[model samples]
Target: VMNRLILAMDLMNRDDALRVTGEVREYIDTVKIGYPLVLSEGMDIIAEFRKRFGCRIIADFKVADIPETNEKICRATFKAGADAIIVHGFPGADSVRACLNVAEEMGREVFLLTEMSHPGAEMFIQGAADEIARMGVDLGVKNYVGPSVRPERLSRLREIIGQDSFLISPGVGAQGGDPGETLRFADAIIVGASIYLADNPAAAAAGIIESIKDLLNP
Candidate 1:
């Protein structure tokens, strides 16, 4: 289980994308391709990233739809060079199970949305965590994307889901969740504005990654 400092570049600008890709590639091991880039630049961006960096990529589309449609999108995403895809847990067990089935057949990982580190996330994620936990047990679907700041609740979630599942954490840095603290709750951290908004995105990303390393080592 490698701890990943994942930089999420959600911006729509190509220059910003190039800067972020070039800068982060120098330090980070993983990156999450989210809505803005995917919608604006599409597979070309992903192909370019893969061509240049050759690091692991997680597509954060958070797709939520009927099983047939979701499976179709999953196929396209996997072919687009994504190692993992995220889907909403609130999409009911059937939809999630459908996506899980596609993931199993295609051999790509799927992360269930458990919690988010945003204002009033509790109204959604807290209950989603419990529901996802129950489904994770019954359906054997492991892997989750959780809020970085809510480690104690997430710790409890890990216990409920057992140790086999992995967590992808978002909302580090500018979102007020320190890398050290987020590291304790997540197997992978998805940082966006904190790195992208900096004058030196690479240094900022490396700094946070080093901070996480310090916490892990200590």
Candidate 2:
């Protein structure tokens, strides 16, 4: 499959998130709802985004809870019009399975978080990266969240997860991730501040899209 771009709607305000989505919907293949927006607007925003943009929505909850709570959250996320949801692998197989069961029943996707993009992540996630990937794969998860700012780490993850896994990388622009290098191993790039904080959100998205395409094609 061709590499895709996911617009991370991490804005604190509902109106601003909607406005940015309107400007860059055409350039992005999916919209990722972050914790801040979900906390501020609730599930209604998910339905609203689907109604307005007609694109796939990913609930980036990074869920890490008990089995029952994870299942409920997964069910609610899909009910809210999300096509996919993210879960942290640190929660163990049972917790991940809870969400996966609901996703399977609801016909939605789940992306497992193996590592994060921030500098501090290395301190916590690096040690368990391989184990996380292995557990996710064993649990029948085909998608994973890999680091973006560190291309070498991403490459190592790709090696661990194999080429068939769909890896999504965040922290592209504002986080200083080089899409040209990162996208080589990532199946989709999740961008937030780089696009939303730009003077022209649409142009910023277009530029990133162009950069991705150029790298893939070249």
Candidate 3:
């Protein structure tokens, strides 16, 4: 079964990150890892996470580069055992497709990130969000990442991608997004500071789960 919560393990400290992740392991089967942790700890942490927690790792590299470079990045990420990698659609179709090509050849997956969360997204990403999402659809992307802080935008992306495509959103908890509301459009919600930085990480994760109980198996 697909879990409802995706812990955004952005903590830079390896020991704290791993400990907090393990503490909430029962509530989540997937975790999102970004540059803050990976750059600080190394890509080997991806393999170590899978070995110890048996959780799926979504490498949030937010990749935006030339096609050749994008291909190389995805190749290395998959080699490091990331179940899926996040690619930025704002980089245009060719760059996005490069990651998709490498993922398919390697038997892994790629999630096209349509729009970022609030604040600065108003600049360029907000205006281009729709086209980016549609571009993802045209390219046959089956997974997506959008803003948890914008349910309306998330709903629109959901429409563009159709019903079967998987969508996950970030910005919950610490960023003041509601888990239950975010899940109304996204298949799963990515949470970070609110849970990982909590006094009791497991309890914080459990509370979020409890609040979204009605939506868990849907």
Candidate 4:
């Protein structure tokens, strides 16, 4: 499992993302590098983050593609130093298995995204989430991502994946997710604007950790 706090570096500004993350490095030991930052600065930024912070990076590419393409995406991502990559399981078992195979080949990890937190995803993702989680469990997936916005669903996902699987949740802080409650199910919560957009990012990160002290390691 990762630290209880995973910084979601969604800021498009390279300098700004680094500056903010550096400020909170003491509070967070894992970072999520998604399209916003990578698209703006290119894959080189992942290397820079590793060099600068020595923190684990979760490449939030949300990989969804045909089996052949999925393998290439996982190959390039792990080659670029991602400790793990997020993949959409609804794309079917073949797509997920492709990433899993690449992760096994590269000594990396694949986190199956069981459900999304946004309103738009509720239309389809929410409905398919259970079967997707079951499929991932069947495929021997050990890591997952769930929605913090709904602790009920998160808990259900935990049940589906079982007690030993490593599960993380996103949609905290700015998304109105309570860090404390989210931890009731998630091992860590992916936080974005709540920390990155704060005027004092380090203090913001510290305050969140402070607030969740009661459930720090649960």
Instruction: Estimate the Cα RMSD of every predicted model relative to the unseen true structure.
Output: 2.0, 1.8, 0.9, 1.0
Model 3 spans > 4 angstroms off: none
lDDT tens per residue, model 2, 1-218: 23378888899898888998898866775888978999998889999988888888889999999999999889888998899999999889999999989999988899999988887887978888889888988899988898798888899889888888889899888889988788889988888898998889999987887767775542
Off by over 4 Å in 2: 1-3, 216-218
Whole-structure CA lDDT of model 1? 0.78
Give residue 90's error in model 2 in angstroms. 0.6
Candidate 1 — which residues are off by over 4 angstroms?
Answer: 1-3, 216-218
What tens digits encode model 3's per-residue C-alpha lDDT throughout 49-165?
999999899999999999999999999999999999999999999999999999989999999999989799999999999999899998999999988888899989988998899
Q: Is candidate 2 or candidate 3 better by TM-score?
A: 3
As for candidate 3, its clashing pairs are none
| CA lDDT scores, all candidates in order | 0.78, 0.87, 0.93, 0.93
Model 1 Cα lDDT, one tens digit per residue, 10-127? 8788778877778777777677898888888777677677777887788888888988888888888888888888888777788888878878898988888866777787786676
lDDT of 4 by residue, 73-183 (tens): 999999899999999998999999999999999899999999998899889999999999999999999999998998999989998998899988999999899999998
Q: What is candidate 3's CA lDDT for residue 111?
A: 96
How high a TM-score does candidate 3 get? 0.98
TM-score, every prediction: 0.91, 0.95, 0.98, 0.98
Clashing pairs in 4: none
